[PDB]
C-alpha cells in the first residue's frame, strides 16, 4: 500500500459525531488538521446541538490514529495509514466503571482531500447524576499508552486500554476501552507486530467562542518495536 504517502504533509480533518446517551441526543462537528510527520493533531470541536450532555474529555478517544508518527524503522507496522484512502471502521466499547458504557462505530477515510472521521455513538445505563451525565470530570486528559495488536482473523488490529479521567473530588473514573479496526476496501493492509501508541493532549477553550466546544492539541507516536543495529543497514 502507498497510503502513507497521503500523510507526508498537513492534511485537513473533518470529524462528525452523532450521539445518544441515555436518550440525551447531541451532535459534534470538529475541524482542523493532522501532521503525521510530527504526530500532531490540532482540532476544534463544537457541539452543534447546544449543550454537550457528557464531559468533553470522555469523547476524546472517540473523536484518527492514521496521524500517529510511526518511527522510520516501524513504518511497516502502521495499519492505519495502510488502509487509506479507502479507510477503516473503528468500533469501541467504552465501559465507565460503576457507570454506563459507550458503543461507537466510526468510519475513518478520505473524502476528497480531507481525512474524515464520522462516528455514531450510543451510551446506555448511565447514572443521571454519575460523573458523566453529572459533569464531574476535570477538563484535561492524562498522557496514556495504548497497546496495539494484530487481528489477523479480521485483517485488522485490536486494542484494549484504560483511560483514567480525573474526577473533581480527586478520585479517578476508569474508562475501559475495547477497540477493533477493520479495513473498508480490499487492498493490502499492514498487519503489525505488537506495539503501542503514546498519546499526549492539551485541552483548551477559544475565548471568542460561545458555543460549547473543545480546542484540542494532541500528539501520537508509535513505540515498542524492539529495534537492533541490523536495521542500521
Is-cis flag, bond preceding 85, omega within 30?
Answer: yes
The span from the CA of 66 to the CA of 86, in Å, is: 12
Element (H, E) at 82: helix 79-82
> Cell match 474529555: residue?
57
**Grid cell of 200 as nine digits:** 499526549
The span from the CA of 62 to the CA of 49, in Å, is: 18
The architecture CATH gives domain 3-223: Beta Barrel (2.40)
Method by which the model was determined: X-ray
- Contact at 8 Å (CB) between 13 and 30? yes
Q: Please choose, from the candidates 218, 213, 174, the residue with its C-alpha nearest in 3D space to the C-alpha of residue 36.
A: 218
**Grid cell of 194 as nine digits:** 505488537
Residue 25 neighbours by CB under 8 Å, 6+ apart: 18, 19, 49
Judge residue 9's burial from the number of C-beta atoms within 10 Å of its C-beta, 0-12 exposed, 13-18 middle, 19 or more buried: exposed
Half-sphere exposure of 166 (CA within 13 A, CB side): 8
Amino acid at each position: 500500500s502507498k497510503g502513507e504517502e497521503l500523510f507526508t504533509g498537513v492534511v485537513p480533518i473533518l470529524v462528525e459525531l452523532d450521539g445518544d446517551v441515555n436518550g440525551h441526543k447531541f451532535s459534534v462537528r470538529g475541524e482542523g488538521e493532522g501532521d503525521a510527520t510530527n504526530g500532531k493533531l490540532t482540532l476544534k470541536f463544537i457541539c452543534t446541538t447546544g449543550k454537550l450532555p457528557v464531559p468533553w474529555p470522555t469523547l476524546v478517544t472517540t473523536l484518527v490514529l492514521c496521524f500517529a508518527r510511526y518511527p522510520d524503522h516501524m513504518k511497516q507496522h502502521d495499519f492505519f495509514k495502510s488502509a487509506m484512502p479507502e479507510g477503516y471502521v473503528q468500533e469501541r466499547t467504552i465501559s465507565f466503571k460503576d457507570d454506563g458504557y459507550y458503543k461507537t462505530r466510526a468510519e475513518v477515510k478520505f473524502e476528497g482531500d480531507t481525512l474524515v472521521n464520522r462516528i455514531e455513538l450510543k451510551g446506555i445505563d448511565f447514572k443521571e447524576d454519575g460523573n458523566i451525565l453529572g459533569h464531574k470530570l476535570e477538563y484535561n486528559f492524562n498522557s496514556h499508552n495504548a497497546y496495539i495488536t494484530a487481528d489477523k482473523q479480521k485483517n485488522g488490529i485490536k486494542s484494549n486500554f484504560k483511560i483514567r479521567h480525573n474526577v473533581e473530588d480527586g478520585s479517578v473514573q476508569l474508562a475501559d476501552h475495547y477497540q477493533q479496526n477493520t479495513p473498508i476496501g480490499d487492498g493490502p493492509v499492514l498487519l503489525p507486530d505488537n506495539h503501542y501508541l503514546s498519546t499526549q493532549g492539551a485541552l483548551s477553550k477559544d475565548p471568542n467562542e460561545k458555543r460549547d466546544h473543545m480546542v484540542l492539541l494532541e500528539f501520537v507516536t508509535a513505540a515498542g518495536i524492539t529495534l537492533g543495529m541490523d536495521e542500521l543497514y
